[PDB]
Design a protein that fits this description.
The PDB classes it as immune system. The complex is a heterodimer of chains A (205) and B (218). With 205 residues, chain A is an all-beta fold. Chain A is built from no helices and 19 strands. Chain B starts with a strand and ends with a strand. The chains are: A mainly beta (205), B mainly beta (218). Bound molecules: a molecule of 2 linked components (GAL-GLA) and potassium ion (K). The site of potassium ion (K) has 3 residues of chain B, from loops.
């Protein structure tokens, strides 16, 4: 089985550096070209770097978006490929995947998340969403002005937790809602934000 | 660089029907080796992309014969026969004839299901939030299909523009519906300028629009 495992992702400030690593098994590493591809909502999939093999003198190829700031390298003694990223910008945010090439980009790792922001870690402000439509009653919690992702919301059956939106401020916001048949209506939302060491239980009347 | 144009962004299909995705390149993809390095990827929800078809028409290991690729030069098509739930995801076209290697914007293959009207709710800002100097007003649309819905905010007898943000869930794995939040964010000052807050929803499943409102301070 082909196995690709990326690591090294995380949170960094604009202008700073970060090195990603990939470790591969299941093909003769030294015989195949390796690539990094990233994914963001705004740009979709973007191939960013390739490194070839001994017969190509380990030549490197880059998208214009990263040439000269990013460096791809490989260690054939460790079946490892690296991406050294310099002068990171908010536009570099996304999921970074390691790939090998035989037919195309034949297998991809799970990916490593890179987040680029000058925002300080901040725990959410949690506000109740308090009151029927097609028999249903809805209540929820607004989880406002936190950084970074993620939050987890739990309730003490019709739960929707919306994708976070990044605000002008650089802080995220989302709502988590409970839909119950009105006749089946003390609701408490438990909001966990690991990065800020914050846990809020909020009563919704 | 070579721009890959795929259509549509979102493609509804009924289970067991045929789906067809189109991709165009801005440059011929015939390589000097005489091969056409045009490929398709599938990305299922929460997963990495997987190679589906390479060199126009060759199914990758484990890809069933329901998937059929065709085309030449700059114009390509993927045909998926007898669509199954395992086929739903985002399909990407790609070229690797020319460096830089490039991708289309993706086509979400979505389950086409019967129309479902949203259940709609409005939530005033909490007394706690207003003590912080901001007012978040939330409109909630639950369990609708298709994804298109018009959410219009109304303050008193009139309309709002450019101060709201929508967030939409992924198509639900069990009921194949969407849910949506629309959040109107105002300073406390701007919130206290008006008495009546309303969100009006227009959707295929509603014979007429549904309005949910509150009076500030009720
Ligand atoms: O040359 C374009 C071609 O590159 C990749 O295939 C190469 C193959 O040409 C070379 O001989 O061997 C290397 C080994 O890693 C790759 O298999 C792409 O996979 C192919 O789609 C095409 O873009
Ligand atoms: K209608």
């Amino acid at each position: 089985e082909v196995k690709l495992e990326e690591s090294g992702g995380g949170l960094v400030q604009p202008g700073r550096s970060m090195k990603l690593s990939c470790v591969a098994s299941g093909f003769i590493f030294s015989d195949y070209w390796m690539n990094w591809v990233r994914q963001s909502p705004e740009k979709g999939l973007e191939w960013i770097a390739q490194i070839r093999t001994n017969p190509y003198n380990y030549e490197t190829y880059y998208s214009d978006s990263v040439k000269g700031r990013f460096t791809i390298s490989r260690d054939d003694s460790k079946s490892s490929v690296y991406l050294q990223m310099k002068n990171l910008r908010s536009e570099d945010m996304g999921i970074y995947y390691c790939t090998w090439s035989h037919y195309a980009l034949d297998n991809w790792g799970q990916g490593t998340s890179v987040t680029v922001s000058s925002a300080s870690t901040k725990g959410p402000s949690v506000f109740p969403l308090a009151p029927t439509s097609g028999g249903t009653a809805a209540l929820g919690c607004l989880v406002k002005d936190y950084f970074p992702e993620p939050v987890t919301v739990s309730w003490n059956s019709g739960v929707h937790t919306f994708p976070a939106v990044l605000q002008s401020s650089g802080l995220y916001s989302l709502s988590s809602v409970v839909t119950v048949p009105s006749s089946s209506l003390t609701y408490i939302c438990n909001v966990n934000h690991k990065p800020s060491n914050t846990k809020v239980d909020k009563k919704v009347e | 660089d070579v721009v890959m144009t795929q259509t549509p962004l979102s493609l509804p299909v009924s289970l067991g029907d045929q789906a067809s995705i189109s991709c165009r390149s801005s440059q011929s993809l015939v390589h000097s080796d005489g091969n056409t390095y045009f490929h398709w990827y599938l990305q299922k929800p929460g997963q990495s992309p997987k190679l589906l078809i390479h060199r126009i028409s060759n199914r990758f290991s484990g890809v069933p014969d329901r998937f059929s690729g065709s085309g030449s030069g700059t114009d390509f098509t993927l045909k998926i026969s007898r669509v199954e739930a395992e086929d739903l995801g985002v399909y990407f076209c790609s070229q690797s004839t020319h460096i830089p290697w490039t991708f289309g914007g993706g086509t979400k293959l979505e389950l086409k299901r019967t129309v479902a009207a949203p259940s709609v709710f409005i939530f005033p800002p909490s007394d706690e939030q207003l003590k912080s100097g901001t007012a978040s007003v939330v409109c909630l649309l639950n369990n609708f299909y298709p994804r298109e819905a018009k959410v219009q905010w109304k303050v008193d007898n009139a309309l709002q523009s450019g101060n709201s943000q929508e967030s939409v869930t992924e198509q639900d794995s069990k009921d194949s519906t969407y849910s949506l939040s629309s959040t109107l964010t105002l300073s406390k000052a701007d919130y206290e300028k008006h008495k009546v807050y309303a969100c009006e929803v227009t959707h295929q499943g509603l014979s007429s629009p549904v309005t949910k409102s509150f009076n500030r301070g009720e």
